[PDB]
Amino acid sequence: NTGEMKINWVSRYMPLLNKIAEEYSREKPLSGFTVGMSIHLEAKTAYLAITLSKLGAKVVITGSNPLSTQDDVAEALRSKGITVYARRTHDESIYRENLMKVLDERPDFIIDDGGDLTVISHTEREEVLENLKGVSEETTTGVRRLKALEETGKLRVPVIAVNDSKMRYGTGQSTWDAIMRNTNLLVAGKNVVVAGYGWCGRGIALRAAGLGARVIVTEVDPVKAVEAIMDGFTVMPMKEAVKIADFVITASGNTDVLSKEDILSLKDGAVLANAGHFNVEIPVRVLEEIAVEKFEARPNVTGYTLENGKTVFLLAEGRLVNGHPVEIMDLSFALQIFAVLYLLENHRKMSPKVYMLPDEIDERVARMKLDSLGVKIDELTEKQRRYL
Amino acid sequence: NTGEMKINWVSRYMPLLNKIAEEYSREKPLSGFTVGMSIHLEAKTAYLAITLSKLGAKVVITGSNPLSTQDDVAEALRSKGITVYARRTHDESIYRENLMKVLDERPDFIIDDGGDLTVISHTEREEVLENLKGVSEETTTGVRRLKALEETGKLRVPVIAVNDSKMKYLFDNRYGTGQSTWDAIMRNTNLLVAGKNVVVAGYGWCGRGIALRAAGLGARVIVTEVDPVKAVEAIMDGFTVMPMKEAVKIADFVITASGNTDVLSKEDILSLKDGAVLANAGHFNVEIPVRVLEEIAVEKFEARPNVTGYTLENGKTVFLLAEGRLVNLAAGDGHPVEIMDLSFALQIFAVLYLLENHRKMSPKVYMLPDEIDERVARMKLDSLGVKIDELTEKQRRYLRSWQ
Amino acid sequence: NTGEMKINWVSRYMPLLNKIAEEYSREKPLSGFTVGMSIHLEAKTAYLAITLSKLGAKVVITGSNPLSTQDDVAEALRSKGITVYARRTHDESIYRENLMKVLDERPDFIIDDGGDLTVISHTEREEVLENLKGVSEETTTGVRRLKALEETGKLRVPVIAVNDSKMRYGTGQSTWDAIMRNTNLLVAGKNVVVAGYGWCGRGIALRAAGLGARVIVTEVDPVKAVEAIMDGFTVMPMKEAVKIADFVITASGNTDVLSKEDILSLKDGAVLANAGHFNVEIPVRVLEEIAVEKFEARPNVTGYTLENGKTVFLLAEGRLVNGHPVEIMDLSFALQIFAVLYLLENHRKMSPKVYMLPDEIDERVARMKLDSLGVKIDELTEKQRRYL
Amino acid sequence: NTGEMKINWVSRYMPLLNKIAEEYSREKPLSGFTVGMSIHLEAKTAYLAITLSKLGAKVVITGSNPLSTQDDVAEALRSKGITVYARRTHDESIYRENLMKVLDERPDFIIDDGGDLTVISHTEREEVLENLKGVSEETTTGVRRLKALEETGKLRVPVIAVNDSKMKYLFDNRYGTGQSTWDAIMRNTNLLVAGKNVVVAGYGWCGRGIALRAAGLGARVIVTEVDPVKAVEAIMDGFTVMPMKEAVKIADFVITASGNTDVLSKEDILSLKDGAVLANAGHFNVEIPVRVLEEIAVEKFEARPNVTGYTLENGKTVFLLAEGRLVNLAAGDGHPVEIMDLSFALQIFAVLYLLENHRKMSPKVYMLPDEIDERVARMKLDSLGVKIDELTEKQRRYLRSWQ
Ligand SMILES: NC(=O)C1=CN([C@@H]2O[C@H](COP(=O)(O)OP(=O)(O)OC[C@H]3O[C@@H](n4cnc5c(N)ncnc54)[C@H](O)[C@@H]3O)[C@@H](O)[C@H]2O)C=CC1
Ligand SMILES: NC(=O)C1=CN([C@@H]2O[C@H](COP(=O)(O)OP(=O)(O)OC[C@H]3O[C@@H](n4cnc5c(N)ncnc54)[C@H](O)[C@@H]3O)[C@@H](O)[C@H]2O)C=CC1
Ligand SMILES: Nc1ncnc2c1ncn2[C@@H]1O[C@H](CO)[C@@H](O)[C@H]1O
Ligand SMILES: Nc1ncnc2c1ncn2[C@@H]1O[C@H](CO)[C@@H](O)[C@H]1O
Ligand SMILES: [Cl-]
Ligand SMILES: [Cl-]
Ligand SMILES: [Cl-]
Ligand SMILES: [Cl-]
């Protein structure tokens, strides 16, 4: 079975979930409990569900899945007694109905996505609050929403912010890897303009220089501009920089980092990419307004042909240009399972507030990972403990 | 349209090929000549074929495409009068038949891939040697094979080894062969590279790129070698060097980049950890001994697309990517556009040098003429708007003197 | 004159002090004021004194100077009407007497070193507090002492912490530059052990790997150990690591990072260096105790020959292994002059507390530096200000 | 004692030279031969002389030491029976006389510095050519000068160019010549490099190291060149390339690393900014035209130790380091110990190859024999305890075949 084969592949490479099953699948700490989940359904998340089931949980899952591609995985989970509501979830009203179906099962613990199950539970499905004991939230958007819910005084259950989004060549390595993958263009020997020289922009500039680019930085803060100069970059106004730029990367946290005049000064073939959080830095609406032709040049690359006859290329529709390997999801899933187990053990002692993941869980998972790698480390002596 | 769009993208970023067309497309120096090619077919190589055609050549191509893709690019080439045989080339006998199809056109010049067409011309299709005036070869495997023909006195045409180029040392191959190799591995496996033991067999241009990229991804890299100079290089790059027999004991990934045969033995294979992943970046599929895997395995199964599981007599299962064939070219991003533009420029000028000089050349493998490297470097500078200094007469006499 | 020539050299390359003189030497804002200074006396600090004099100040300086090497600079300052007490300052009681001599001049503003003039003014020389209007303190030790003085409720004058100690290949670049300079040894192809993987240790490890070393990390924190593994380093206990180490660099903030057994396992010729703040990390006393012979191998390198016949080398007597260029001191001096001018203008409105250098001064100096380099930067639009 | 302590330090970290002594000091292959040397004298080069003496050679040395230092090292060598003439060599006529002193000893082999001794032997001291059996030359300037003797038919002894070595490309020269050059500049000037415009003339081994180190220190680097290949390399490294005439207009530092003459013209000099700092890293002091500075300057003065101010007709003052002589060797840290150990090993084996083979060699400049690079790489691996793989017979036949 293709679904079973997908799961078998990931099962080979999720050592922490395998260790958690070895340690807890006889005790079955979640026997008699239901765990409701909203997650993107694929073999890796399936294995999290399977692991929770080995620990005794009744697992009920909604998959946010706009294609049919992982239906084989859904069907394999259903064969293992796990309840899966994932078909037709391209429609928004069906995703919400599937969330309602998870809540129909009166979950004891929720592994949420974006806070969706939890917010519904507090607003339209309050009857589930009786049985709901705790929520684990791994998404940054979810933790924000549940903190905002706390701040209104409406949160009724403990929430753990699993808070594992924190994750060699610095912060700019991922950005340039994505730019290279999406364009297949050389960075060496090119003029790269970086707008903003905070931690993000500096990383992007340093990596570009390591790839062999000549780097120009734009800034509005004189202190930051001096820093860029002392790192060996050229600083000049954007109006000048766009005239020679092969790449322009916005890292400013600002709006309209390029004007209409700036765009009309770009070289034919210039590549634009945003490394900030929102699509306002490169004014996509301005490109759409002034272009005489818009086309898909490559996957994730949009060409805009301008009134001056030149074409410029925008990566990823102006969104953050920079979906994880099996072992990384194994680590994230281990932290999430331990969060649910912590809530199981301690929820009666916890307030209806958002807690940061207890540091003990980070240390337990790290130790388990070292153990699975065969790595040994040092231990503090008595003299060293007395010193610290 | 999709084929044409792919070619349109690369055309915008191939300034040397575009300058070559500007300089020679009116003169048509290759008018009345056929250029035979063996390539991995994709937009960049299509642009090389297009440029040769603009110079007047009849261009006939076979694509080593076991991937079974780029048909759109093939159709775009066909609409421009370029003959392309790339379909079904996963089957080795179909790739060979397509080589024979190229030779049926009696090429005047060959731009080869690994010496494939040239070796056949010397061993099975000797009738084509009459008309064949010169070969351009870019790969280390091809140059080795053609040097082996020379050394035994069987080579009958002049060959220019373009891989000699001074500008090979220009680019850092970690974001050519390295990045494309690791992207392919990551796509086929979805496995983490960070914190893994990665073994690279061979520390030449290809293997060093693969090793540096793996270290960049957070792997601990172990290098195997037979050349002590190369092994010292690996050490000085910060890697561990040891014999394969030891390296296999701890390897999570083993990547072959040697150009040799049987870089793993049966005994090496039986020492691999359960779940080890094996991949080849060399020309031929004999580096990892696929036949040995097939022979000793208790069970064989397809684990996922492009991943074959082999369960061994010791109970362990090892995974082979892409049937031991070269892993990194199927996505069409083996090297950056501008790097291929440079490489292709050198190749075009090698062909033009053979056109001009072949009557004067022996049936030997020649290093790329230095004049070609300098031509292409100058055209690159000009395309960037860069000016440099010129020696004075005083300086020229100083350099020719002993003080 | 050799003193005059030293000053002339630095004068050519201190563009911010030259600009400050151009802007203020007609106004003479410090005319009628005395500025007392304790500083290491050399051509660069002389030029700060000269600049303050051009601004009208009577300048009275004590030099902490244990050699006679800058006596020519002292004599050139005296020729310009600046009062200098720097001879024989190798003796500690003479340094203190020279500080007393500065305080005899009843300074209006002090540019202190280590808080020495200020603490004396508050404890033994309280009569100077009448006329003392403000203190500028650039040293980290000085700011600590004056903050501690504040915390006892005994500080009587405003103090500005000039707070410019904040200063391409990361934090490890300076460390390795120093190790290379002091040993003349190759780093490529060596085994480097880094003890601790906080920001300091990580920087040192990353730079070592960039130099071509094979890097081993030791740690006591499993979370940090995992980080080092995912950066591509080998993690093992120090007891194992010392057996193969060519270099051992301590970056732990701990004591006795190497034991006696660890030291006796080092290879003949191993090099040890501390990148932490205190000389407890590598137990220098233990090396001194167990060595059969101690010698100076090279400047800044001590050899210890052990009972096992092997010799190991310690850099910089176990102190932080990693004194600035003219233009860097120009920047520091500009911030200090502006701190004194800020105190001049505002001291009547300030409490007797330690203030951080006002951000306006950082921005003014940065802008002056950009201006002197001919660099132009961008300016926020109205839309951008409204967005932020 | 201080001299001996300096030598004791380097001896601990020169494993190849120590292994050479272990292997050949009992046999004494150089017994009855004199080896003449021109070196910058310091502990590392002293260890090379010591090692040659352990092999039986009579060693006679002149030190290019314009610095006026390492007398302690000279005295240590004298106590070991090695003849050293290094004092007062700031004066060019004294350095030349010391070269003549080496030639007075009728060396059988010369280890040269820039071809100095060999060129004199051919031009002024031809009587020594009878006994001279071979020359080893490590520098690009030396090889050029000796090639110029060959090309005019004036060379009379075989020369091995050790700079050909495969292992030059091993090390990254930013922490050899680069770091030592910038340390010297920083010592002589106390000026900031970060945020400055640095111009490097020449992008070979020396200049690329200087440029990369400057970029590492935070400089904006501009490269000048006459070779288009080298200029493209500089571009691909992230540097700006332009003609010197333009580069001088914005330069804070100009560093010459060309091996040529008159890399600045009078017109270039008159375009420099007030306060520009000029330094040379080439062999000879003609790269920066010191005589032109001396001729056109309105005033000349010593600004600080090792720094000459020249005030020009345009009112601007420019500063020259070390009288335009090579700036980076005076501190004795030109390269790391282990790098010089490698280089010296190659040189010793070059001498031993000449001892064995000179009767069979033409009076030509030869590339370093590949066998020597492989010997030294293997000894390096052995010293590190590294083992590598050996080719099988199947593999050897595969590599000699054309498939
Ligand atoms: N995948 C791709 O994109 C590309 C593939 N290639 C192919 O990759 C192969 C390697 O090419 P290059 O790096 O240019 O060759 P190279 O000759 O520069 O390096 C190959 C290295 O393998 C070493 N080696 C040979 N047999 C070995 C063994 N049994 N164990 C360990 N090391 C061994 C050699 O000593 C040599 O240093 C060739 O087949 C070449 O055609 C090359 C370039 C592109
Ligand atoms: N300071 C030191 O520690 C060392 C000094 N040297 C010396 O440095 C010099 C350079 O040596 P390498 O880098 O090995 O030589 P190289 O031949 O590799 O590079 C010199 C470069 O200078 C370029 N060039 C020549 N004339 C030029 C001009 N007028 N303007 C700009 N570029 C020009 C050439 O095209 C070449 O690329 C030689 O004199 C050599 O003996 C080399 C090694 C050590
Ligand atoms: N319009 C802009 N252009 C360039 N840099 C900017 C702009 N707006 C903000 N920044 C800078 O971006 C960095 C990250 O917010 C800050 O250092 C800030 O000064
Ligand atoms: N004895 C030690 N050995 C190694 N790392 C240590 C030791 N003591 C503290 N550290 C680590 O050093 C880093 C900086 O304090 C921290 O990550 C801490 O865990
Ligand atoms: Cl590891
Ligand atoms: Cl990388
Ligand atoms: Cl700059
Ligand atoms: Cl550097």
Show Cβ contacts of residue C267 under 8 Å, excluding neighbours closer than 6 positions. Answer: C243, C244, C245, C246, C310
Residues in chain C closer than 8 A to D186 (CB atoms): 325
Q: Which CATH number describes the domain made up of C171-323?
A: 3.40.50.720
Instruction: Find the B170 Cα to ligand 1 centroid distance in Å.
Output: 18
Instruction: Give start-end residues of each CATH 3.40.50.720 domain in chain A.
Output: 171-323
User: Residues of CATH 3.40.50.1480 domain(s) within chain B?
Assistant: 1-174+335-386
Burial A58-94 (b: 16+ CB within 10 A, else e): bbbbbbbbeeeebbbbbebbeeeebbbbbeebeeeee
Residue at B373: amino acid letter: D
Which helix (H) or strand (E) element contains residue B85?
strand B83-85
Cβ(B59)–Cβ(B37) below 8 Å:
yes
CA–CA gap between residue B228 and residue D374 (Å, rounded):
6
CB of B190 within 8 Å of any CB in chain A? yes
Of B128, B131, B138, B263, residue with least CA distance to B207: B263
C-alpha distance from residue C289 to each of C306, C312, D162 (Å): 10, 14, 48
Query: Can you tell me which residue has the tokens 């490590």?
Result: D138
Single out the residue of B27, C378, B132, D150 nearest to residue A239, CA to CA.
C378
Residues B223, D283: Cα–Cα separation, whole Å = 38
The one-letter code for the residue type at C308 is: N
What is the C-alpha separation between B90 and D100, in angstroms, rounded? 72
Q: How many CB pairs under 8 A join C and D?
A: 69
Q: B304 contacts in A (CB within 8 Å)?
A: 5-6, 9
Q: How far apart are CA B215 and CA A386, in angstroms?
A: 38
Q: What is the rounded distance in angstroms from the CA atom of residue B175 to the CA atom of residue B173?
A: 5
Please provide residue C314's backbone torsions phi and psi, each rounded to the nearest 5 degrees: -110, 125
User: What 3-state DSSP class applies to C11?
Assistant: helix
- Secondary structure (3-state) at D318: strand
- Are A161 and A356 within 8 A, CB to CB? yes
Subunits with at least 3 CB pairs below 8 A relative to chain D? A, B, C
Element (H, E) at D382: helix D370-384
- Please answer yes or no on whether B215 and C231 come within 8 Å at the CB atom: no
Chain A positions in Cβ-Cβ contact with residue C384 (cut-off 8 Å): 254-256
CA pair distance C289, C270, nearest whole angstrom: 18
Residue type, B229: V
| A277 annotated as a binding-site residue | yes
Which residues line ligand 3 at a C-beta cut-off of 6 Å?
Answer: A 195-198, 201, 218-221, 224, 252-254, 257; C 378, 384
CB-side neighbour CA atoms (13 Å) of A170 = 22
Residue at token pair 């020719």: B400
Contact between C135 and C37 (Cβ < 8 Å): no
Q: What distance in Å separates the CA atoms of residue B374 and residue C179, rounded to the nearest whole number?
A: 41
Alpha carbon A236 to chain centroid, angstroms = 34
The alpha carbon of B377 and the centre of ligand 5 are apart by a number of angstroms equal to 41
Using CB atoms, which residue from D171, D186, D193 is nearest to C188?
D171
The contacts of residue A161 (CB under 8 Å, 6+ apart) are: A137, A143, A146, A354, A355, A356, A357
Nearest 5°: phi and psi at D41? Answer: -80, 125
Rounded distance, CA D377 to CA B231, Å? 8
β-pairing, D58-63 with C159-161?
unpaired
| List of residues 6+ apart from B291 with CB closer than 8 A | none
φ, ψ at C150 (rounded to 5°): -60, -50
CA A321 to chain centre: 13
In order of A330, B148, B323, C308, D241, the CA distances from B99 in angstroms are 47, 20, 21, 69, 45
CA distance B56 to B352: 12
> Kind of pairing, strands C234-235 and C214-218?
parallel
Which candidate, C44, C36, C39, C29, places its Cα nearest to that of C110?
C36
B205 lines ligand 1 (CB under 6 A): yes
Residue C155: partners with Cβ closer than 8 Å, 6 or more residues away:
C122, C146, C149, C352, C353, C354
Starting from the edge strand earliest in sequence, which strands make up the sheet with D220-224, in order?
D240-241, D220-224, D197-201, D253-256, D277-280, D317-321, D307-311, D299-304
The Cα of A217 is separated from the nearest Cα of chain C by a number of Å equal to 9
The helix (H) or strand (E) run that includes residue D240 is strand D240-241
- Sheet of strand B299-304, all strands in order from the earlier edge strand to the far edge: B240-241, B220-224, B197-201, B253-256, B277-280, B317-321, B307-311, B299-304
3-state secondary structure of C340: helix
The answer to whether B331 faces chain A, any CB pair under 8 Å, is: no
For residue A101, give both structure tokens: 């179906």
With a 6 A CB cut-off, is B184 part of the ligand 1 pocket?
no
* Chain length of chain D: 403
Token digits for C238? 């120090």
| Residues in chain C, overall count | 388
Token pair recorded at residue B295: 């022979």
Contact in structure between D329 and D40 (CB atoms under 8 Å): yes
Ligand in closest contact with the CA of C204: 4
Specify the 3-state DSSP secondary structure of D2. Answer: helix
**Contact status, residue B241 vs residue C255, Cβ threshold 8 Å:** no
DSSP conformation class of D80:
T
Identify the DSSP state of D358.
G
The order of strands in the sheet holding A83-85 is A83-85, A58-63, A34-39, A109-112, A134-137, A159-161, A354-356
3-state helix, strand, coil in chain A (%, to 5): 45, 15, 40
Q: C310 Cβ partners below 8 Å, 6+ apart?
A: C266, C267, C268, C269
Residues A312 and C296: their CA atoms lie apart, in Å, by 64
Question: Quick check: B159 and B118 in contact, CB under 8 A?
Answer: yes
Going across the sheet that includes C301-305, the strands are: C234-235, C214-218, C191-195, C247-250, C271-274, C311-315, C301-305, C293-298
- The technique is X-ray
Per the structure block, which two tokens stand in for D46?
């002293």
Calpha distance A259→C381 (Å, rounded): 11
Q: What is the DSSP string of D112-165?
A: ESTTHHHHHHHHT-GGGGTT--EEEE-SHHHHHHHHHHHHTT---S-EEEGGG-
**What is the architecture, at CATH level 2, of domain D175-334?**
3-Layer(aba) Sandwich (3.40)
If DSSP codes are grouped into helix, strand and coil, which group holds residue A74? Answer: helix
Q: Taking chain B, what is the end-to-end CA distance rounded to the nearest angstrom?
A: 65
Domain at D1-174+335-386: CATH architecture: 3-Layer(aba) Sandwich (3.40)
Rounded CA-CA distance C352/C381 in Å is 40
Phi, psi of D366 (to 5 degrees): -95, 140
Among D5, C110, C337, C226, which Cα is nearest to A328's?
Answer: C226
**What phi and psi values does residue C296 have, to the nearest 5 degrees?**
-85, 110
The three-class DSSP label of residue B149 is helix
CA neighbor of C16 nearest in space, from C328, C354, C375, C380: C328
Spell out where C222-263 has E strands.
234-235, 247-250
Q: What is the largest CA-CA distance in chain B?
A: 76
Q: Report how far apart, in Å, the C-alpha atoms of C340 and of each of A255, C10, C64, C109 are.
A: 38, 22, 21, 7
Q: CA nearest A178: which of A249, A264, A257, A84? A: A249
Task: Give Rg (Cα) of chain C.
Answer: 25
Q: Which of D162, D134, D109, D108 is nearest to D369 (CA)?
A: D162
* C-alpha–C-alpha distance, residues D255 and D177, integer Å: 12
**Token pair of C142, please?**
């000085």
**Strand locations in chain A, DSSP E?**
34-39, 58-63, 83-85, 109-112, 134-137, 159-161, 191-195, 214-218, 234-235, 247-250, 271-274, 293-298, 301-305, 311-315, 354-356
Give the whole-angstrom CA distance, residue B11 versus residue D307. 53
CB B3 within 8 A of CB B74: yes
Q: List the single residue in D179, D193, D218 with the smallest CB-CB distance to C180.
A: D179
Q: Nearest C-alpha to atom 19 of ligand 2 is from which residue?
A: D204
Q: What angle do CA B126, B129, B135 make, to 5 degrees?
A: 120
CA–CA dist C83, C73 (Å, integer): 12
To the nearest 5 percent, what fractions of chain D are helix, strand and coil?
A: 45, 15, 40
Question: Please, what is the Cα angle at B282 between B281 and B288, to 5 degrees?
Answer: 85
Chain region(s) in chain D for CATH 3.40.50.720: 175-334
CATH 3.40.640.10 correct for A1-170+324-374: no
3-state secondary structure of C313: strand
Residue pointed to by tokens 């100690």: C165
